[PDB]
Amino acid sequence: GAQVSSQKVGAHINYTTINYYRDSASNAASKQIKDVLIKTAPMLNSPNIEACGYLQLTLGNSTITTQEAANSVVAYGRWPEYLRDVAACRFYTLDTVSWTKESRGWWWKLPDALRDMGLFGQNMYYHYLGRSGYTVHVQCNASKFHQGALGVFAVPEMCLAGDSNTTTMHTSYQNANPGEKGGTFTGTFTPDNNQTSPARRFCPVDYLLGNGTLLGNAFVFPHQIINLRTNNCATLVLPYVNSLSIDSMVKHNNWGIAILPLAPLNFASESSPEIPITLTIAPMCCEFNGLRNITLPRLQ
Amino acid sequence: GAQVSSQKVGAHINYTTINYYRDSASNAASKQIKDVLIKTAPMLNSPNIEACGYLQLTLGNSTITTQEAANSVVAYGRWPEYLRDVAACRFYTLDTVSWTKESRGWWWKLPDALRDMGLFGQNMYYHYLGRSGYTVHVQCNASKFHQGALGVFAVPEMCLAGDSNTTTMHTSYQNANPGEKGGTFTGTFTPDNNQTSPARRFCPVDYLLGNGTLLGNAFVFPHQIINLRTNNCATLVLPYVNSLSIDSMVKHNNWGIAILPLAPLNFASESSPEIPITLTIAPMCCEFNGLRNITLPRLQ
Amino acid sequence: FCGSMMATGKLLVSYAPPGADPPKKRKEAMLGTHVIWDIGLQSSCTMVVPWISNTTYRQT
Numbered sequence: 001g002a003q004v005s006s007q008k009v010g011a012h013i014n015y016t017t018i019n020y021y022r023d024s025a026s027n028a029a030s031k032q033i034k035d036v037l038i039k040t041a042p043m044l045n046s047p048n049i050e051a052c053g054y055l056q057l058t059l060g061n062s063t064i065t066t067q068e069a070a071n072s073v074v075a076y077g078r079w080p081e082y083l084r085d086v087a088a089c090r091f092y093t094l095d096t097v098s099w100t101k102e103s104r105g106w107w108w109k110l111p112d113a114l115r116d117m118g119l120f121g122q123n124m125y126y127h128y129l130g131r132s133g134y135t136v137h138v139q140c141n142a143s144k145f146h147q148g149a150l151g152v153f154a155v156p157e158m159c160l161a162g163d164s165n166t167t168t169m170h171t172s173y174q175n176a177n178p179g180e181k182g183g184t185f186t187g188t189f190t191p192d193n194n195q196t197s198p199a200r201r202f203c204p205v206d207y208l209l210g211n212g213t214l215l216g217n218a219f220v221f222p223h224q225i226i227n228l229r230t231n232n233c234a235t236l237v238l239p240y241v242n243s244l245s246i247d248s249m250v251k252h253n254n255w256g257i258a259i260l261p262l263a264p265l266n267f268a269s270e271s272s273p274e275i276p277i278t279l280t281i282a283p284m285c286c287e288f289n290g291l292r293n294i295t296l297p298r299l300q
Numbered sequence: 301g302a303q304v305s306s307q308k309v310g311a312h313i314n315y316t317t318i319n320y321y322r323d324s325a326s327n328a329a330s331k332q333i334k335d336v337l338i339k340t341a342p343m344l345n346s347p348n349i350e351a352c353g354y355l356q357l358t359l360g361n362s363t364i365t366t367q368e369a370a371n372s373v374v375a376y377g378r379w380p381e382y383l384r385d386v387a388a389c390r391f392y393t394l395d396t397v398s399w400t401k402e403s404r405g406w407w408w409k410l411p412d413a414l415r416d417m418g419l420f421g422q423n424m425y426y427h428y429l430g431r432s433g434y435t436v437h438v439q440c441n442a443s444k445f446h447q448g449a450l451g452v453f454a455v456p457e458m459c460l461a462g463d464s465n466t467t468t469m470h471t472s473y474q475n476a477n478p479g480e481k482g483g484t485f486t487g488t489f490t491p492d493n494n495q496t497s498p499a500r501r502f503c504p505v506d507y508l509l510g511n512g513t514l515l516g517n518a519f520v521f522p523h524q525i526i527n528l529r530t531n532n533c534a535t536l537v538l539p540y541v542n543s544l545s546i547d548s549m550v551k552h553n554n555w556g557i558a559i560l561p562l563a564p565l566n567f568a569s570e571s572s573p574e575i576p577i578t579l580t581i582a583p584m585c586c587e588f589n590g591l592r593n594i595t596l597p598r599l600q
Numbered sequence: 601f602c603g604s605m606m607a608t609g610k611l612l613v614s615y616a617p618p619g620a621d622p623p624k625k626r627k628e629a630m631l632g633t634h635v636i637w638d639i640g641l642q643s644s645c646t647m648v649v650p651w652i653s654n655t656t657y658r659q660t
């Protein structure tokens with residue numbers, strides 16, 4: 001059973017191997033042009049609804065009307081799919097937010113943001129387990145005389161940093177889960193000094209993506225940019241991502257949506273402009289499991 | 301185009317017909333052993349889960365364990381089917397009632413009785429239209445020394461009579477629709493005489509099936525009998541019945557379940573006995589349509 | 601949309617099948633059959649209200 005193979009050589013002969021043990025774990029580590037501009041691993045680079053082979057975007061009775069599409073991205077090059085081997089899952093439009101010359105950014109979590117959306121939300125709380133992918137459609141228009149740029153980031157397991165410097169990992173379930181409402185980024189860290197009666201919530205610094213890493217590198221995550229000059233909307237198609245095939249939607253949030261001003265909003269000459277950002281999100285290829293009496297969370 | 305055919309004769313020659321008009325409506329009316337015990341039209345006579353070709357009775361996570369089955373009936377010989385050309389629809393057990401030496405009877409309406417049952421109820425109120433069949437399982441056990449007989453009747457369009465003698469068809473939506481709770485029969489008609497502030501509710505006399513017809517004839521309706529001597533439970537499989545393929549579940553109740561003591565409860569020698577009757581009902585081959593914001597009824 | 605070329609915007613057109621409170625807010629209109637119209641991109645917008653009724657026919 002001796003295994004002979006080519007040695008790791010320079011560029012101007014081989015070695016032999018025998019496995020002594022029954023468990024593979026015991027085994028030694030087995031070590032494995034024209035156009036430079038081309039990506040080695042495209043999918044890791046944020047492809048388009050176009051770029052993997054896949055306008056009126058429609059789910060159930062809900063439907064987006066979109067010319068914008070080169071502005072879309074399929075996370076990790078992977079399209080949503082059923083746990084293999086429903087019109088509760090449709091497009092829900094969340095409460096519109098306002099972008100101003102001084103906004104630092106906004107965040108949301110999935111499924112959390114959708115927890116009260118019609119039959120979807122119901123299905124979520126009546127079952128132990130649930131899984132779902134998403135289509136995130138960020139809407140934000142302005143004039144040809146306005147300027148600015150939004151960075152729309154979809155982060156897997158988006159754990160955010162807390163307000164305390166005396167204790168760690170202590171943000172309350174209530175605070176961690178804002179629902180549709182949102183949750184927002186800040187320009188500076190402000191430690192919750194109230195010892196006795198703790199705020200127990202996140203303190204997300206913008207240039208650190210609220211998680212201890214530099215915002216400039218947030219682009220290694222599935223993302224899209226809204227440049228007011230060229231486009232008014234972004235569409236992110238998100239797959240179910242997890243260390244499990246299915247999980248508790250109530251205990252665990254799979255994806256995080258982060259929206260930050262890469263370039264600040266500016267208009268004509270007004271000292272203080274504003275424009276709306278509307279998020280319409282739809283759950284995809286979704287399925288639930290382990291039906292029983294309804295979960296009634298202490299959200300407060 | 302003259303049509304020649306055999307005349308309606310005695311038993312010891314024909315006539316001719318021509319249609320003069322373009323609309324069929326204008327047309328005249330076109331007029332069409334061994335063992336006597338056999339039914340001409342069986343299906344009209346209340347068949348069994350057995351008798352048309354169809355123990356653990358199971359829907360989704362819900363499951364009945366039944367030996368009793370010759371005690372089942374498929375209404376109108378017709379099994380539930382999808383509107384042709386889901387685990388919200390499972391077995392729900394309603395609040396148990398008590399049968400006593402003086403009970404006159406009980407009634408319920410479908411879908412109404414199920415309006416608050418988990419995801420079923422939700423689905424009902426989030427959609428304009430819905431259709432469903434049902435499996436009604438009536439449970440009622442006693443001892444070999446108890447006696448009595450329950451008549452379980454499934455009535456299509458079970459319109460019930462009201463409490464007023466000064467005005468007609470006036471029972472309020474609230475009163476007409478009791479939900480799971482029930483609704484009950486009475487031995488005597490008691491006219492709501494409060495003119496100024498009307499009770500606006502039903503007054504269902506038992507021997508008149510609460511509808512002006514004699515109880516003894518209620519058997520022309522899909523039914524089953526629980527004879528304490530021979531069996532402790534009854535199962536009725538109900539098809540969607542209506543003048544439409546699908547309708548408003550909120551405005552209209554399709555089936556009525558009526559349970560009446562054909563023979564009064566009696567035990568050993570106790571002057572006043574009691575035994576429980578539990579109803580477990582499951583919606584079948586069910587489907588909904590016309591999703592929108594939720595219906596919030598004024599049920600009170 | 602008969603406004604100017606320099607004008608931009610997004611509108612939501614909605615249809616809600618009967619049986620519930622008539623929509624007074626986007627939040628509830630959102631829940632039924634709907635279309636999102638981008639004014640800036642195209643000047644006009646069509647929405648089909650599909651036949652959905654309990655009865656075979658409706659009265660006039």
Ligand SMILES: *C(=O)CCCCCCCCCCCCC
Pocket residue numbers: 001002018019020021
């Ligand atoms: C395939 O492996 C057959 C040739 C094996 C060469 C024999 C010498 C190997 C000595 C180690 C075997 C004992 C280790 C558990």
Ligand SMILES: *C(=O)CCCCCCCCCCCCC
Pocket residue numbers: 301302318319320321
């Ligand atoms: C088939 O109908 C051909 C033979 C018809 C016999 C002709 C006489 C029928 C006279 C009545 C026809 C006019 C009524 C609209």
